[PDB]
Amino acid sequence: KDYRKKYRKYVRSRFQCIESLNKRYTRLRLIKEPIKMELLFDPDDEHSEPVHTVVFQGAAGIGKTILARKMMLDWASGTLYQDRFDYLFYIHCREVSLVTQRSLGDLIMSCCPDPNPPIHKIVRKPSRILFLMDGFDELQGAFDEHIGPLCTDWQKAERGDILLSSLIRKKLLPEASLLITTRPVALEKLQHLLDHPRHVEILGFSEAKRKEYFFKYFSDEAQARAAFSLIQENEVLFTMCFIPLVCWIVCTGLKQQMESGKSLAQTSKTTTAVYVFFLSSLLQGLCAHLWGLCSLAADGIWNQKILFEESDLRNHGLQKADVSAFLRMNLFQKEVDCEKFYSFIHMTFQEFFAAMYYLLEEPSRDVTVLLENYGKFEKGYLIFVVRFLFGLVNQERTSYLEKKLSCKISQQIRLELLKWIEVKAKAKKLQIQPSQLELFYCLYEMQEEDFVQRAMDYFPKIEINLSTRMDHMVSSFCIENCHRVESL
Numbered sequence: 001k002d003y004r005k006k007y008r009k010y011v012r013s014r015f016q017c018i019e020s021l022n023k024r025y026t027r028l029r030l031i032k033e034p035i036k037m038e039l040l041f042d043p044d045d046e047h048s049e050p051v052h053t054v055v056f057q058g059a060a061g062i063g064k065t066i067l068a069r070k071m072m073l074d075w076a077s078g079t080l081y082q083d084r085f086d087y088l089f090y091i092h093c094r095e096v097s098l099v100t101q102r103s104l105g106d107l108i109m110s111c112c113p114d115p116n117p118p119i120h121k122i123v124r125k126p127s128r129i130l131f132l133m134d135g136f137d138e139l140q141g142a143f144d145e146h147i148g149p150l151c152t153d154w155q156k157a158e159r160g161d162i163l164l165s166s167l168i169r170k171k172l173l174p175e176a177s178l179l180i181t182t183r184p185v186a187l188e189k190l191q192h193l194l195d196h197p198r199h200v201e202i203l204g205f206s207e208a209k210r211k212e213y214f215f216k217y218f219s220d221e222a223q224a225r226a227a228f229s230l231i232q233e234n235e236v237l238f239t240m241c242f243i244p245l246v247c248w249i250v251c252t253g254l255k256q257q258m259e260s261g262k263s264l265a266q267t268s269k270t271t272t273a274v275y276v277f278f279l280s281s282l283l284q285g286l287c288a289h290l291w292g293l294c295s296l297a298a299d300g301i302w303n304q305k306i307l308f309e310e311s312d313l314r315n316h317g318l319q320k321a322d323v324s325a326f327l328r329m330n331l332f333q334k335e336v337d338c339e340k341f342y343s344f345i346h347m348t349f350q351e352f353f354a355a356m357y358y359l360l361e362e363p364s365r366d367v368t369v370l371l372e373n374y375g376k377f378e379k380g381y382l383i384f385v386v387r388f389l390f391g392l393v394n395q396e397r398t399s400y401l402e403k404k405l406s407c408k409i410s411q412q413i414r415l416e417l418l419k420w421i422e423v424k425a426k427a428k429k430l431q432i433q434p435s436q437l438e439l440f441y442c443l444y445e446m447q448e449e450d451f452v453q454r455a456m457d458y459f460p461k462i463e464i465n466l467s468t469r470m471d472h473m474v475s476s477f478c479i480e481n482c483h484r485v486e487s488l
């Protein structure tokens with residue numbers, strides 16, 4: 001009752017996101033599988049009982065964390081679920097340990113600012129509690145559908161996985177509501193726990209909300225109009241910029257380019273080119289400390305570590321003053337509340353530095369054992385580590401950041417990636433690790449006509465499910481680059 005006011009006051013301040021949240025927040029697209037946020041838990045024309053679990057699936061960098069943090073802010077402001085919920089607990093999945101034996105009560109007290117919250121007054125009305133589980137795919141370690149026995153005691157301390165699994169399966173607080181956000185890769189795992197979920201898909205910015213971001217970002221109109229014109233003139237960038245992280249990256253790259261007397265131009269055609277163009281803006285240190293940055297990201301992927309403490313990055317080379325050269329330029333950030341923990345600006349940037357590690361001119365650098373771990377939740381699926389390898393390996397493509405890669409080892413990786421394509425194409429009897437469309441996403445990043453032409457001849461037929469204009473772009477490139485032993 002009176003504590004709800006104290007918790008709401010805390011949620012109002014901690015979710016300010018001054019990395020205002022509102023000052024940059026742009027309307028994200030949400031579709032049921034046109035949904036009004038307030039009626040997410042309201043049952044449909046058929047159901048009489050309300051929805052208890054709602055699943056937000058969306059792209060990497062689409063803004064799942066920003067939507068969760070916006071919901072938290074709007075709720076504590078009064079706007080959202082004023083009469084539907086009394087408590088909204090934000091569970092940052094990357095911070096939750098899958099092995100750490102903890103109770104559901106312990107978890108709720110992590111979301112509380114005070115040391116002694118009234119945990120019994122809080123779980124008094126479970127139906128009035130909504131668990132905002134952010135980043136299910138970001139749960140470090142293996143999340144198995146076989147873990148057990150399940151939990152039905154909120155006070156009982158069970159293994160992190162058993163605890164989260166029991167909450168998802170609605171075994172723990174059955175009438176408490178749940179909002180799980182995740183990339184669609186991990187939806188295979190999540191589907192096996194969900195008790196009648198209502199699926200929703202985050203589809204980034206609309207064609208109008210794309211322009212809107214460019215105008216909330218650029219305080220000047222003459223800057224905003226010119227930066228959006230660069231996106232309109234570029235077919236690939238325009239398509240890519242529905243993803244808000246892509247908008248942030250492009251605007252920040254063009255902002256650094258604007259700082260100099262350099263006429264606006266981004267001739268980027270691949271996701272790898274977008275990340276290499278962005279990183280090259282920050283290269284004025286990130287040249288001598290490139291070995292550390294890549295080894296830290298690779299070690300943090302092989303053993304599932306998003307948050308690296310002071311001791312992780314100290315042993316990796318980057319000292320106390322090097323981390324300041326990465327924080328101010330926007331490459332490293334302080335997370336895990338007011339504690340000395342440093343994680344990458346995004347999981348896609350960690351997967352980028354993990355991919356770059358294998359290509360630096362000198363964990364292990366065996367792409368063979370890296371590719372064997374592809375498609376596993378316990379390793380982060382490695383979707384982007386492989387994609388960035390395909391793009392960086394690109395021989396007929398070089399910038400400043402690409403010139404610091406061994407041309408001898410990037411050729412060996414090129415031949416290894418082509419064998420991996422041949423293996424996946426022929427033995428299609430897999431319960432999906434690299435889908436046929438995902439293999440088209442890998443060949444798109446590659447871009448080289450000598451490689452894509454050879455890699456395309458392995459596929460017997462084209463069987464893919466096109467969903468976004470990106471799917472029909474990436475796969476059309478591969479179809480155009482595929483031609484038989486005598487087609488004509």
Ligand SMILES: Nc1ncnc2c1ncn2[C@@H]1O[C@H](COP(=O)(O)OP(=O)(O)O)[C@@H](O)[C@H]1O
Pocket residue numbers: 024025026027028058059060061062063064065066067135244245248346
């Ligand atoms: N609606 C939005 N408005 C403004 N920026 C956004 C929005 N959604 C995402 N972002 C940008 O994307 C970045 C990462 O997105 P995030 O919400 O963490 O997505 P995900 O969890 O799907 O990777 C944010 O730090 C921010 O720069």
Ligand SMILES: Cc1cc2ccc(-c3nnc(N[C@@H]4CCCN(C)C4)cc3C)nc2[nH]1
Pocket residue numbers: 059060061062185243245246271348383435437438441470
């Ligand atoms: C910041 C940022 C850059 C970026 C570039 C591409 C994508 C992306 N990648 N793959 C998609 N769908 C395929 C479908 C087949 C299976 N594979 C694994 C997934 C869809 C999207 C939007 N997300 C991105 N985020």
